Amino acid sequence: GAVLSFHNICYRVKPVEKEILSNINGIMKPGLNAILGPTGGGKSSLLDVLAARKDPSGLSGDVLINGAPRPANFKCNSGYVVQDDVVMGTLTVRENLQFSAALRLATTMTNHEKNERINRVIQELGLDKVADSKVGTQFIRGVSGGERKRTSIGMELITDPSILFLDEPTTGLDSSTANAVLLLLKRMSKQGRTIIFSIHQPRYSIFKLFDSLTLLASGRLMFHGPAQEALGYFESAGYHCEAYNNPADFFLDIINGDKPLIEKLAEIYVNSSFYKETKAELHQLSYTTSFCHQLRWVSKRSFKNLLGNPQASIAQIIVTVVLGLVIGAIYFGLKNDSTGIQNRAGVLFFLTTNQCFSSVSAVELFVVEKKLFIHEYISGYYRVSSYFLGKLLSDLLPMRMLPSIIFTCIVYFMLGLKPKADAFFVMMFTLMMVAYSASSMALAIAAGQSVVSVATLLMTICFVFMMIFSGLLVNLTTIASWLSWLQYFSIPRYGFTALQHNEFLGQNFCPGLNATGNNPCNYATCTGEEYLVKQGIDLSPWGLWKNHVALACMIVIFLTIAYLKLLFLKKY
Amino acid sequence: GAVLSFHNICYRVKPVEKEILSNINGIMKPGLNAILGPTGGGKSSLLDVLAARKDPSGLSGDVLINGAPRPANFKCNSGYVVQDDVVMGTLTVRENLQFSAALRLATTMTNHEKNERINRVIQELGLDKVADSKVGTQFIRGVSGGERKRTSIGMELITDPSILFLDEPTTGLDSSTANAVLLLLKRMSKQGRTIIFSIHQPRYSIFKLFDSLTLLASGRLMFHGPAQEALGYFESAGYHCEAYNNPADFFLDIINGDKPLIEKLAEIYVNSSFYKETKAELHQLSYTTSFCHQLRWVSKRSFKNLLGNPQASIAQIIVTVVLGLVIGAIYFGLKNDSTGIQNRAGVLFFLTTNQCFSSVSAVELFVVEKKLFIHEYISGYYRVSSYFLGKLLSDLLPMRMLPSIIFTCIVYFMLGLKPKADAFFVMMFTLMMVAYSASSMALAIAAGQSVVSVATLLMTICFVFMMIFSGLLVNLTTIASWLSWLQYFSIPRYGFTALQHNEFLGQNFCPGLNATGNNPCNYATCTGEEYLVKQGIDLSPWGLWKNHVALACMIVIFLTIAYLKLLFLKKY
Ligand SMILES: CCCCCCCCCCCC(=O)OC[C@H](COP(=O)(O)OCC[N+](C)(C)C)OC(=O)CCCCCCCCCCC
Ligand SMILES: CCCCCCCCCCCC(=O)OC[C@H](COP(=O)(O)OCC[N+](C)(C)C)OC(=O)CCCCCCCCCCC
Ligand SMILES: CC[C@@]1(O)C(=O)OCc2c1cc1n(c2=O)Cc2cc3c(CN(C)C)c(O)ccc3nc2-1
Ligand SMILES: Nc1ncnc2c1ncn2[C@@H]1O[C@H](COP(=O)(O)OP(=O)(O)OP(=O)(O)O)[C@@H](O)[C@H]1O
Ligand SMILES: Nc1ncnc2c1ncn2[C@@H]1O[C@H](COP(=O)(O)OP(=O)(O)OP(=O)(O)O)[C@@H](O)[C@H]1O
Ligand SMILES: CC(C)CCC[C@@H](C)[C@H]1CC[C@H]2[C@@H]3CC=C4C[C@@H](O)CC[C@]4(C)[C@H]3CC[C@]12C
Ligand SMILES: CC(C)CCC[C@@H](C)[C@H]1CC[C@H]2[C@@H]3CC=C4C[C@@H](O)CC[C@]4(C)[C@H]3CC[C@]12C
Ligand SMILES: CC(C)CCC[C@@H](C)[C@H]1CC[C@H]2[C@@H]3CC=C4C[C@@H](O)CC[C@]4(C)[C@H]3CC[C@]12C
Ligand SMILES: CC(C)CCC[C@@H](C)[C@H]1CC[C@H]2[C@@H]3CC=C4C[C@@H](O)CC[C@]4(C)[C@H]3CC[C@]12C
């Protein structure tokens, strides 16, 4: 079996440094081990500390498995259940179990066998009635909290872990289901699996199931040893219970007071035989799956989440179509007359801005998953690179490409723009590039930010500032010499400039050309080239492709920054 | 005392109609009355049904207080605690208690006395350590769940209610605090207060506190009567417990199975003496505070929430200032030259759009409170009109007015616009009006909508469509005769038109005027009046003020629509 141990553990949290956990020692031999205590004692903190999930800065003690230190593949053989559930709502139960099993369990086993285990676990936890039901979403009524909790438990139970940690496995579950869950854990722990869990308000039948007990309170350790001997240990010191029915309530009624009480009990413990014995024993003793597989399964999960979140995919497509048709009707039949310039520039500007501002929604779905991503990374699911590229090939690439195609296909021929294929495809390509660059910038800004409202604000502000330098609201030749340099950071500038260059080039907007020919007018701006020059634009085709290479470089740089912001993030 | 009763209750929920509650009967005499049952049984549903919070369409039975029907002032003397807490996070505990006491309790009592009661309740619930701490927020670490729950309880406990309903008063609380809470309830119920509550996993000491028991399961009623006699009732029929320690666990172990089991037990009950007796008894028996006070306290709460939510007030002000300065630097020194027209129109358009699009954030804070508003309305806090006007005088009026002032004060003199006071104040007034109209439209759209992402999408789309008709992106004289009518629904059109009219009117943009004077150029658009005409604008001052009256009418109409959308909302 696995004989976990610890000695002289202490912990600190930061400015001022608070000591959540003080001197703690104990041994957790195979079987069933529990951690009772009141709220705020330090239950969850200790549990994470034992499962290598707290920053090692505060930790100041030795955690040893079987005497030898922590194995490097430790996280590949231990499961951890979270106090607050982390389960993708837009998926079903079975999808999530398949995902966890697929990424964590080895791929030598056939898919039929993994599905077999999944069915077995569903039976064990009593989830047949909601096996295929969707977990909670803001649009669909969610499954009951108990079923969600059992799902979180199963996602880790399927891994066949030799060591298992649970933080409040039974919170909100009715008594019968909780009894079923714990009987299952006992049946499993009688095979060598070393289980460690916290719990609130057990019943006596449960309390007889224990094999080792730990009692945390205000950081300090009150008692550690066999479950049976705890009552007698207290009996000797005092509190002749003889009246309470459930020993757990009795144990807490002493912590809660029913010189300082905490210190008194803790010193009684350190003067107990149990602590001497455990100090004696302590002193005496002292990735699974390749890159491609991770990428594929992450991308599939994101496919499903995106299709199930119908405010960034379907709403976006529909509004794009409606806008395209409306624009087509409004600007219909563009004329080479006085009004031609205004309409043409306006439509191009609108398309550019809409592409730029349509990326906020997609990244926002990337922000919310932060916590989920951290939990899944620590647990040992996927690398960082895999998660990044997966979310890219699932969200950024597919959905952002379509709007440009639809917009151009509808608009170009209704309005009456340049009647050449080259211009058509150039317009489509340019819109794609601005869209991707905006999404990249949003990812860079919003990567590793917990809150969405702040990120949305920042991105919106940045886009506004970029828009002021587009080329239509202000003429860029009037910009002061000490601020024109800012115009090179503007995505809309490159997109709009490139769209204007390929449209106005072969155009003349003064209808009377013989009349215009004899005496041209100084302040007339008849032709497209003159307007182009006045806005400060080159005429050479290099003057067009320069914007595209700039956009590509921006894409590369911003994606790299996002990857690093994720990499040096605090995953603890 | 208060002798509640019910008879033949049934309930339905809708398309297909599901019957959540079947035949139910019982009496809840003064004292302590509990409602045990498993998840999904119908606990919360029954509790709401008894407290007049379910739509009366499904209800099909008689709820009688002391034989006489439900008094009209019933909600003025009964408190109701919610299963999921509804407590304003941005406030402290004491602020919330003051708010509830101020609006619900009468104003004859002095404020010192109300504060006295608040302190007493804080002592009763054990919240001295977190009395002034802020409740959970997305920026500040939140207080523990137990303290939040106790706060929700106190907000209703302070009312001195003759009848009190609780849905899971003790969920997540540690045993000691829960014991304290229930001992408090018992001490209070021994004075005539009739308490009715649900609960999960009581302990035996608690179970002895009961005076009446109700056992719901899958809608059906399993047992109703004195707490003591329940065990013997089962004993007679079966299940010779004699082994379980806590009777509550025993009672549920029979519902959960530890021809159909549910129907069998229910029929055993209807064949019991208890049901005969209660059927016999049933057959035998068968605003506080004015408008101004509500308005003031609602407005104060919104002051505090807005100042505590630093993403719609402080961020907005700061970004406004930064944008104003940047604009001032960019367009600095506008010249009456060829470029004058483009820069002038662009700056005006930008200000208009920014005012229009800056209203999404404020309304979004109005959306999230929907659920809270419904709960507070039903409980009997405030009228609808009060809540509306309060949120208006707190959020819409103050914050939306400032941006225009700041924008104009900074911009007008840096750029070099019309050097006349009249134009300055006209510009300020116009910006105010567009801002208010946009906020009104957002309120109309977002009133009575549960989700924020959908509302944000809708408002953004509407503003975009309005913007396409502003007057700059497209010339409105080229619009087809069968779509120009849509331009009269555009707020930015009125604002932008009014800003342009008072600026370009006294301007000439062709620098060589003697050169221009001898031979004017057809396609020249030198003066401001010509450009104004070409965009399709009247020159008479009525041609300016018409936009303002239109904006005012839009404001009035949209606010009225919002009020009605709230009024005919389903408050049940
Ligand atoms: C003048 C108008 C035209 C020019 C507009 C320029 C926009 C540039 C946008 C890209 C910047 C970027 O990508 O920011 C990248 C930075 C990089 O973060 P980090 O340093 O690696 O943090 C490391 C974190 N650790 C320690 C955990 C690793 O992300 C941020 O700081 C997030 C906030 C950025 C706000 C930027 C607002 C800029 C407003 C400019 C107003 C004049
Ligand atoms: C060219 C410039 C275009 C400008 C368009 C501006 C439209 C503004 C209308 C506001 C009406 C309003 O807000 O009314 C309020 C309505 C609902 O009202 P209700 O049914 O009474 O709900 C009360 C029901 N109760 C009483 C039972 C509770 O909200 C909405 O419908 C929100 C959807 C509006 C979508 C607008 C999309 C426009 C697309 C146009 C494509 C050509
Ligand atoms: C989508 C229309 C447009 O992109 C455009 O092409 O013209 C200009 C402009 C636009 C959108 C927005 N703004 C603008 O000035 C300001 C703005 C704020 C928005 C906010 C508030 N931000 C200031 C954080 C949102 O929450 C959601 C969408 C938002 N969209 C916009
Ligand atoms: N990262 C942290 N930053 C600040 N305070 C913390 C941090 N982690 C814990 N604490 C503080 O330590 C105290 C106890 O936290 P802890 O995680 O141990 O809860 P707990 O004892 O396990 O009870 P429960 O399971 O119900 O959450 C709390 O007051 C908490 O504020
Ligand atoms: N408005 C509703 N729409 C759809 N289903 C509903 C609605 N109200 C109740 N139900 C369903 O009726 C069943 C019983 O719901 P109920 O509210 O009574 O549970 P409960 O008594 O509150 O238990 P608990 O408080 O622990 O969650 C549930 O399956 C629930 O989904
Ligand atoms: C119908 C037209 C005229 C409306 C204009 C387009 C916008 C306002 C409409 C078009 C289709 C709509 C979507 C249609 C379907 C869904 C799925 C539903 O579970 C939530 C709302 C949501 C996401 C709608 C949001 C609003 C929406 C995007
Ligand atoms: C951290 C982020 C914002 C870095 C910003 C880097 C951007 C602005 C850099 C990356 C590559 C650069 C471009 C490289 C080459 C060209 C072609 C030249 O004939 C004009 C300048 C131009 C177009 C540069 C403009 C600035 C540019 C686009
Ligand atoms: C481009 C310029 C104008 C950006 C303006 C950003 C300023 C105005 C915004 C951006 C993010 C905002 C911060 C977001 C979160 C917090 C944490 C909170 O505990 C105090 C307020 C504080 C610190 C906000 C203050 C306002 C803030 C700093
Ligand atoms: C439910 C919502 C969309 C109501 C829409 C009502 C708006 C569009 C109505 C309300 C008041 C109306 C305005 C009242 C007076 C004038 C002045 C006149 O010289 C031109 C028309 C104009 C400007 C009207 C246009 C239409 C108008 C603005």
Numbering used by the authors:
A (entry chain A), B (entry chain B): 34 to 47, 58 to 301, 326 to 353, 369 to 654
In the authors' words:
ABCG2 is an ABC transporter of broad substrate specificity expressed in various tissues and tissue barriers. ABCG2 also functions as a multidrug transporter and exports a wide range of xenobiotics and pharmaceuticals, thus strongly impacting their pharmacokinetics. Here we present cryo-EM structures of ABCG2 under turnover conditions containing either the endogenous substrate estrone-3-sulfate or the exogenous substrate topotecan. We find two distinct conformational states in which both the transport substrates and ATP are bound.
In contrast, the turnover sample containing topotecan revealed two well-ordered structures, which we termed turnover-1 and turnover-2 states, resolved at 3.1 Å and 3.4 Å, respectively. In the topotecan-bound ABCG2 sample, the dominant class (88% of the ordered particles) belonged to the turnover-1 state, whereas 12% particles belonged to the turnover-2 state. Whereas the state turnover-1 features more widely separated NBDs and an accessible substrate cavity between the TMDs, turnover-2 features semi-closed NBDs and an almost fully occluded substrate cavity. In turnover-2, the topotecan density was narrower in the horizontal dimension and longer in the vertical dimension, probably reflecting a rotation of the drug compared to the turnover-1 state. In turnover-2, the gap is even smaller, causing the entrance to cavity 1 from within the membrane to be completely sealed and even the opening to the cytosol to be reduced. In turnover-2, the distance between the coupling helices is reduced by another 4.0 Å. We now found that in turnover-2, Q181 and F182 facilitated contacts between TM1 of one ABCG2 monomer and TM5’ of the other, thus helping stabilize the TMD domain closure. In addition, the arginine residue R184 provides a direct contact, in the form of a cation-π interaction, with the adenine moiety of the ATP molecule bound to the opposite NBD. In contrast, the R482 side chain is rotated towards the external side of the membrane in turnover-2, where the guanidinium group contacts side chains and main-chain atoms from TM2 and TM4 in the direct vicinity of F439 (right). The concerted motions of TM1, TM2, and TM5 reduce the volume of cavity 1 by approximately one-third, from ~1300 Å3 in turnover-1 to ~830 Å3 in turnover-244, which is incompatible with the binding of the inhibitor molecules.
